[PDB]
Design an enzyme around this catalytic site. Structure first.
Site, PDB file in Angstrom:
ATOM      1  N   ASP A  36      31.733 -32.178 -46.271  1.00 47.13           N
ATOM      2  CA  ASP A  36      31.133 -31.968 -44.952  1.00 47.13           C
ATOM      3  C   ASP A  36      31.042 -33.223 -44.080  1.00 47.13           C
ATOM      4  O   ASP A  36      30.147 -34.059 -44.253  1.00 47.13           O
ATOM      5  CB  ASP A  36      29.753 -31.307 -45.104  1.00 47.13           C
ATOM      6  CG  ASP A  36      29.087 -31.023 -43.763  1.00 47.13           C
ATOM      7  OD1 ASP A  36      29.810 -30.949 -42.773  1.00 47.13           O
ATOM      8  OD2 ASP A  36      27.863 -30.858 -43.717  1.00 47.13           O
ATOM      9  N   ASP A 232      33.936 -31.730 -37.539  1.00 46.89           N
ATOM     10  CA  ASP A 232      33.090 -31.205 -38.619  1.00 46.89           C
ATOM     11  C   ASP A 232      33.787 -30.259 -39.604  1.00 46.89           C
ATOM     12  O   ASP A 232      33.996 -29.077 -39.318  1.00 46.89           O
ATOM     13  CB  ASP A 232      31.877 -30.534 -37.940  1.00 46.89           C
ATOM     14  CG  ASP A 232      30.864 -29.949 -38.909  1.00 46.89           C
ATOM     15  OD1 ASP A 232      30.954 -30.195 -40.108  1.00 46.89           O
ATOM     16  OD2 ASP A 232      29.966 -29.251 -38.431  1.00 46.89           O
TER      17      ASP A 232
HETATM   18  C1  LIG Z   1      28.546 -19.160 -42.568  1.00 46.73           C
HETATM   19  C2  LIG Z   1      28.395 -20.240 -43.646  1.00 46.73           C
HETATM   20  C3  LIG Z   1      28.804 -21.618 -43.136  1.00 46.73           C
HETATM   21  N1  LIG Z   1      30.098 -21.527 -42.456  1.00 46.73           N
HETATM   22  C4  LIG Z   1      31.245 -21.016 -43.194  1.00 46.73           C
HETATM   23  C5  LIG Z   1      31.710 -22.030 -44.262  1.00 46.73           C
HETATM   24  C6  LIG Z   1      31.820 -23.465 -43.736  1.00 46.73           C
HETATM   25  C7  LIG Z   1      30.312 -21.884 -41.151  1.00 46.73           C
HETATM   26  O1  LIG Z   1      31.426 -21.772 -40.646  1.00 46.73           O
HETATM   27  C8  LIG Z   1      29.179 -22.414 -40.378  1.00 46.73           C
HETATM   28  C9  LIG Z   1      28.790 -21.774 -39.168  1.00 46.73           C
HETATM   29  C10 LIG Z   1      27.709 -22.286 -38.401  1.00 46.73           C
HETATM   30  C11 LIG Z   1      27.312 -21.614 -37.153  1.00 46.73           C
HETATM   31  C12 LIG Z   1      27.011 -23.452 -38.841  1.00 46.73           C
HETATM   32  C13 LIG Z   1      27.403 -24.103 -40.049  1.00 46.73           C
HETATM   33  C14 LIG Z   1      26.677 -25.289 -40.509  1.00 46.73           C
HETATM   34  O2  LIG Z   1      25.475 -25.426 -40.339  1.00 46.73           O
HETATM   35  N2  LIG Z   1      27.435 -26.221 -41.144  1.00 46.73           N
HETATM   36  C15 LIG Z   1      26.787 -27.436 -41.664  1.00 46.73           C
HETATM   37  C16 LIG Z   1      27.110 -27.589 -43.154  1.00 46.73           C
HETATM   38  C17 LIG Z   1      26.895 -26.294 -43.906  1.00 46.73           C
HETATM   39  C18 LIG Z   1      27.994 -25.661 -44.564  1.00 46.73           C
HETATM   40  C19 LIG Z   1      27.788 -24.441 -45.277  1.00 46.73           C
HETATM   41  F1  LIG Z   1      28.804 -23.841 -45.895  1.00 46.73           F
HETATM   42  C20 LIG Z   1      26.498 -23.858 -45.332  1.00 46.73           C
HETATM   43  C21 LIG Z   1      25.405 -24.487 -44.677  1.00 46.73           C
HETATM   44  F2  LIG Z   1      24.200 -23.925 -44.739  1.00 46.73           F
HETATM   45  C22 LIG Z   1      25.597 -25.705 -43.964  1.00 46.73           C
HETATM   46  C23 LIG Z   1      27.214 -28.735 -40.914  1.00 46.73           C
HETATM   47  O3  LIG Z   1      26.644 -29.872 -41.577  1.00 46.73           O
HETATM   48  C24 LIG Z   1      26.798 -28.788 -39.438  1.00 46.73           C
HETATM   49  N3  LIG Z   1      27.506 -29.889 -38.807  1.00 46.73           N
HETATM   50  C25 LIG Z   1      27.060 -30.329 -37.504  1.00 46.73           C
HETATM   51  C26 LIG Z   1      25.608 -30.701 -37.558  1.00 46.73           C
HETATM   52  N4  LIG Z   1      24.798 -29.782 -38.373  1.00 46.73           N
HETATM   53  C27 LIG Z   1      23.351 -29.902 -38.179  1.00 46.73           C
HETATM   54  C28 LIG Z   1      22.837 -31.185 -38.791  1.00 46.73           C
HETATM   55  C29 LIG Z   1      22.294 -32.202 -37.954  1.00 46.73           C
HETATM   56  C30 LIG Z   1      21.813 -33.414 -38.527  1.00 46.73           C
HETATM   57  C31 LIG Z   1      21.875 -33.606 -39.940  1.00 46.73           C
HETATM   58  C32 LIG Z   1      22.417 -32.588 -40.777  1.00 46.73           C
HETATM   59  C33 LIG Z   1      22.898 -31.378 -40.202  1.00 46.73           C
HETATM   60  C34 LIG Z   1      25.263 -28.868 -39.271  1.00 46.73           C
HETATM   61  O4  LIG Z   1      24.527 -28.137 -39.923  1.00 46.73           O
HETATM   62  C35 LIG Z   1      28.485 -23.585 -40.817  1.00 46.73           C
END
Ligand SMILES: CCCN(CCC)C(=O)c1cc(C)cc(C(=O)N[C@@H](Cc2cc(F)cc(F)c2)[C@H](O)[C@@H]2NCCN(Cc3ccccc3)C2=O)c1
Length: 390
Positions: A36, A232
């Site tokens: 990630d 990302d």
């Molecule tokens: C549906 C399950 C997740 N998937 C499919 C597989 C990848 C997505 O496509 C998806 C969709 C959304 C709308 C949000 C995020 C998401 O929150 N991704 C974050 C990582 C993640 C992956 C997962 F598989 C499951 C999770 F629960 C989380 C990432 O860090 C994202 N990147 C940008 C910033 N932030 C917020 C952030 C801000 C500061 C510190 C940490 C995180 C994020 O969450 C992931």
């Protein structure tokens, strides 16, 4: 390719994420870890969970060190709560080094783990500024560099298959490469083009121009980076600021108007299917994102095909039709260049030179008539003004 030991070390798919094998503890405990670039915490399941068939067992590690501190990470998608500690960490198919790193042992989670993703943890590769609880919790890659001779750089080749991978196929398929400490030339064709990392927190970049089939989306470029634009791997879709999403969809609909698709399709919620092999790729437009170059007043562009923004999905009837979901969606947190975009390119996270490089991926999906591209240079003025300031 000078990093053969790391080539093909990734598994997975855009919809469930790409993961690399890692070991934690002494004796080593093997775990699959989500790559990630959009977060900065190294965290692993450390307690039973319905979607986990394995987890980190602290009591079995002689090298486990308890930090006596709780940790909470709220992602856009889900969240987890855990206990902080450190332990010895290695990457079997990576640099032959062992490092002591911060590890959040996940004890509670909500909508984080994905049923069948085959991963049990997450490797946040971004900067300490966004690490939880705060920037004092050194990210894994920072520890790796400080403790070894590994160059402060990593590169990602995410490989979408271009078709549905069932549960057994996705376990045996090579999903890509994560090259730690270098750039492997066998993973891309053509030239690498670099865009500045605007600020070291997320891998933040600046988009200066957007085209749909060569047609300028024609928005104030500041809109493209509202309130930020990031690279990302931890997000499936290309996510766009509300106003940009609306304009992009309107233009993509106009370019593909020879065929009508239900609103559910454009909302990224419902699949569209075509008889096997008949997907009308050519009616869909290519999307070009212009990125600030390293030279003053100079930009370059990355071009993606519908083979990237239409994500392969198995028909709810498992038929022989080729089906897809629209992988472009609305964001309230800025542009997110997710996995479906990264699948078209070899992406170089050059931390040492504070820049991100893009080159056409040797594994991007295309057709006989069009290919993804990375092209430059282009004269572009006032690009600094495209960046957003709160
Ligand atoms: C549906 C399950 C997740 N998937 C499919 C597989 C990848 C997505 O496509 C998806 C969709 C959304 C709308 C949000 C995020 C998401 O929150 N991704 C974050 C990582 C993640 C992956 C997962 F598989 C499951 C999770 F629960 C989380 C990432 O860090 C994202 N990147 C940008 C910033 N932030 C917020 C952030 C801000 C500061 C510190 C940490 C995180 C994020 O969450 C992931």
């Amino acid at each position: 390719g000078s990093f053969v030991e790391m080539v093909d070390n990734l598994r997975g798919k855009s919809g469930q994420g790409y993961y690399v094998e890692m070991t934690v503890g002494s004796p080593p405990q093997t775990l699959n870890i989500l790559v990630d670039t959009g977060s900065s915490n190294f965290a692993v399941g450390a307690a039973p969970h319905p979607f986990l068939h394995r987890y980190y067992q602290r009591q079995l590690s002689s090298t486990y060190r308890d930090l006596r501190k709780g940790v909470y990470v709220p992602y856009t998608q889900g969240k987890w709560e855990g206990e902080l500690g450190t332990d010895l960490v290695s990457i079997p198919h990576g640099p032959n080094v062992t490092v002591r790193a911060n590890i959040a042992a996940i004890t509670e989670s909500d909508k984080f783990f994905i049923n069948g993703s085959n991963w049990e943890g997450i490797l946040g590769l971004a900067y300490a500024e966004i690490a939880r609880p705060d920037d004092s919790l050194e990210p894994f890659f920072d520890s790796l560099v400080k403790q070894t001779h590994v160059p402060n750089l990593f590169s990602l080749q995410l490989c979408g298959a271009g078709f549905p991978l069932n549960q057994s196929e996705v376990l045996a398929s090579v999903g890509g490469s994560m090259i730690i400490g270098g750039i492997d030339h066998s993973l891309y064709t053509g030239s690498l083009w670099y865009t500045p990392i605007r600020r070291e927190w997320y891998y933040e970049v600046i988009i200066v121009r957007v085209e749909i089939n060569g047609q300028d989306l024609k928005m104030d470029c500041k809109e493209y980076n509202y309130d930020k634009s990031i690279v990302d791997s931890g997000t499936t879709n290309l996510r766009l600021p509300k106003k940009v999403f609306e304009a992009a969809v309107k233009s993509i609909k106009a370019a593909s108007s020879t065929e009508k698709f239900p609103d559910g399709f454009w909302l990224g919620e419902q699949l569209v299917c075509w008889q096997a092999g008949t997907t009308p790729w050519n009616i869909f437009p290519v999307i070009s994102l212009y990125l600030m170059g390293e030279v003053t007043n100079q930009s370059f562009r990355i071009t993606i095909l519908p083979q990237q923004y239409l994500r392969p999905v198995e028909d709810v009837a498992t038929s022989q039709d080729d089906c897809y979901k629209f992988a472009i969606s609305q964001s309230s947190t800025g542009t997110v260049m997710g996995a479906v975009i990264m699948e078209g390119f070899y992406v170089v996270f050059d931390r040492a030179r504070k820049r991100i490089g893009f080159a056409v991926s040797a594994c991007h999906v295309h057709d006989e008539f069009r290919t993804a591209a990375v092209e430059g240079p282009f004269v572009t003025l006032d690009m600094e003004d495209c960046g957003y300031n709160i």
